[PDB]
């Protein structure tokens, strides 16, 4: 998900 | 000249972090996607909640509108895209073929095609009417963070954690340009300018750059914001003054002067990372949305 950091 | 964006509405209803907001091309609507597996549709001018669109089995990282404002496409961790009829809320098509999360999506201007990017490192081009995959581009060597068509659809731009931006010929799938710059920081976002001549690229070193596509040259850089961890959407604002707009990991919306690169406004109010911003097609209106501790969308209005 985009909502989780790299 | 500086803008004076002020808060007009806070839109609540998503039960997890919001991932992406987009205005309809006709200006009527804002669409939002979320980690909660849902798309929500809101009135652009009064903020009124209109409906919820559901069916993905996992969260949604992106959503995009067809040119006539009648269709949506969404990109999901369930490895599919879905094409939706907005007025009925029905899933018209499920686009299958990526082997990992689908992260980003967009219609071309004609809206007969959809382009998607995935953590599987590929870019796919899909036929709207049949839902069949027309082309798989071996686009990158790391997750694909963004995909965008130029103003007539002849070109696709893609970005990746591999540090590259690539420009592709839509008709053939062949790569026309690779943008590289120095120490290859991960590229977290890319999109064409409205005239199709420039490309705006975000990198995970707290930096935005404007590139001249023809020349291969960086013309402007924009700094002062926080961007090291998330793929944050950025925008050209063209309805009044010519700005660059972006979310930020310090919970602010940043607005810069495109030409001078000076920060002209910071919008305060969100209580978590501002992962997405969008600019209304005709009015000086910005939509912003935030992650887990906030989960809301804010609409802002300016006189220029």
From CA B206, how far away is CA B226, in angstroms rounded? Answer: 5
From CA B228, how far away is CA B33, in angstroms rounded? Answer: 22
Question: What is the total residue count of chain A?
Answer: 6
Q: Which of B186, B231, B292 sits opposite A2 (nearest CB)?
A: B231
The pair of structure tokens assigned to B242 is 């010519």
From CA B294, how far away is CA B274, in angstroms rounded? Answer: 9
CA B228 to chain centre: 17
Q: What are phi and psi of B82, to 5 degrees?
A: -130, 140
From CA B165, how far away is CA B191, in angstroms rounded? Answer: 10
Inter-CA distances, B164 with B24, B85, B167, Å: 29, 34, 10
DSSP B185: P
Helix, strand, coil distribution of chain A in percent, nearest 5? 0, 0, 100
Per the DSSP assignment, residues forming a β-bridge with B173 are none
Contact B139, B101 (CB under 8 A): no
Contact B110, B149 (CB under 8 A): no
SS3 (DSSP) at B223: coil
Q: Which of B173, B96, B168 is nearest to B130 (CA)?
A: B96
Inter-CA distances, B218 with B221, B222, B246, B277, B286, Å: 8, 11, 18, 23, 26
Query: DSSP for B231-244?
Result: ---EEEE-SSS-EE
What experiment produced this structure?
X-ray
Per the DSSP assignment, residues forming a β-bridge with B29 are B43
Pairing type for strands B102-107 and B113-118 reads: antiparallel
End-to-end CA distance of chain B: 8
Chain B from 95 to 134: CB within 8 A of any A CB:
101, 103
Q: Which of B67, B32, B64 is nearest to B51 (CA)?
A: B32
Q: Which residues are CB-neighbours of B143 under 8 A, at least 6 positions away?
A: B103, B118, B119, B121, B160, B161
Cβ-count burial B114-140 (b if 16+ within 10 Å, e if not): bbbbbbbbbbbbbebeebebebebebb
CA B274 to chain centre: 13
Contacts of residues B207-214 at CB distance under 8 Å and 24 or more positions apart, as own/partner, are: B208/B234, B208/B244, B208/B246, B209/B181, B210/B244, B210/B258, B211/B165, B211/B179, B213/B167, B213/B177
Nearest chain A residue to B101, by CA: A1
From CA B297, how far away is CA B262, in angstroms rounded? Answer: 26
From CA B172, how far away is CA B194, in angstroms rounded? Answer: 23
The pair of structure tokens assigned to B55 is 């069916």
Angle at B259 between CA B258 and CA B264, to 5 degrees: 55
Write the burial class of residue B182 (CB in 10 Å: 0-12 exposed, 13-18 middle, 19+ buried): exposed
Instruction: Kindly compute the dihedral angle of the four CA atoms of residues B280, B276, B57, B144, in this order, to the nearest 10 degrees.
Output: 110
Write the burial class of residue B16 (CB in 10 Å: 0-12 exposed, 13-18 middle, 19+ buried): middle
CB-based contact B20 A2, cutoff 8 Å: yes
Sheet containing strand B165-169, strands side by side: B144-149, B155-160, B165-169, B175-179
CB-based contact A3 B19, cutoff 8 Å: yes
Q: How many CA atoms lie within 13 A of B69 on its CB side?
A: 12
Q: What is the resolution of this structure in A?
A: 1.8
Please tell me if residue B189 touches chain A, with a CB cutoff of 8 Å.
no
Fold of B139-250: Methylamine Dehydrogenase; Chain H (2.130.10)
Domain range summary for chain B, segments of one domain joined by +: 139-250
The pair of structure tokens assigned to B179 is 């943008």
Angle at B69 between CA B64 and CA B70, to 5 degrees: 100
Q: Which of B61, B161, B204 sits opposite A2 (nearest CB)?
A: B61
Per the DSSP assignment, residues forming a β-bridge with B167 are B157, B177
Nearest chain A residue to B77, by CA: A1
Q: Which of B119, B38, B42 is nearest to B278 (CA)?
A: B42
Q: Which residues are CB-neighbours of B142 under 8 A, at least 6 positions away?
A: B121, B160, B161, B162, B186
Pairing type for strands B285-290 and B274-279 reads: antiparallel
Inter-CA distances, B59 with B78, B257, B271, B274, Å: 7, 35, 21, 18
Question: What is the total residue count of chain B?
Answer: 304
From CA B144, how far away is CA B94, in angstroms rounded? Answer: 20
């Amino acid at each position: 998900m985009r909502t989780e950091p790299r | 000249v500086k803008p004076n964006y002020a808060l007009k509405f806070t839109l609540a209803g998503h039960t997890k972090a919001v991932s992406s907001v987009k205005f309809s091309p006709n200006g009527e609507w804002l669409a939002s996607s979320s980690a909660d597996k849902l798309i929500k549709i809101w009135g652009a001018y009064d903020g009124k909640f209109e409906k919820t669109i559901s069916g993905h089995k996992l969260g949604i990282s992106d959503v995009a509108w067809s040119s006539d404002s009648n269709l949506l496409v969404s990109a999901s961790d369930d490895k599919t895209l879905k094409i939706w009829d907005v007025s009925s809320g029905k899933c018209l098509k499920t686009l299958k073929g990526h082997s990992n999360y689908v992260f980003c999506c967009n219609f071309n201007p004609q809206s007969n095609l959809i382009v998607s990017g995935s953590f599987d490192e590929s870019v796919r081009i899909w036929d709207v009417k049949t839902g069949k995959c027309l082309k798989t581009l071996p686009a990158h060597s790391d997750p694909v963070s963004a995909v965008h068509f130029n103003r007539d659809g002849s070109l696709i731009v893609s970005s990746s954690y591999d540090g590259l931006c690539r420009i592709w010929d839509t008709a053939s799938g062949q790569c026309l340009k690779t943008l590289i710059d120095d120490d290859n920081p991960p590229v977290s976002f890319v999109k064409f300018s409205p005239n199709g001549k420039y490309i705006l690229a975000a990198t995970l070193d707290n930096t935005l750059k404007l590139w001249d596509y023809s020349k291969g040259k960086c013309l402007k850089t924009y700094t002062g914001h926080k961007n090291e961890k998330y793929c944050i959407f950025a925008n050209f604002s063209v309805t009044g003054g010519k700005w660059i707009v972006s979310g930020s990991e310090d919970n602010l919306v940043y607005i810069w002067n495109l030409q001078t690169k000076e920060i002209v406004q910071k919008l305060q109010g969100h209580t978590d990372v501002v992962i997405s911003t969008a600019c209304h097609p005709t009015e000086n209106i910005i939509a912003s949305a935030a992650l887990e501790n906030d989960k809301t969308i804010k609409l802002w209005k300016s006189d220029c």
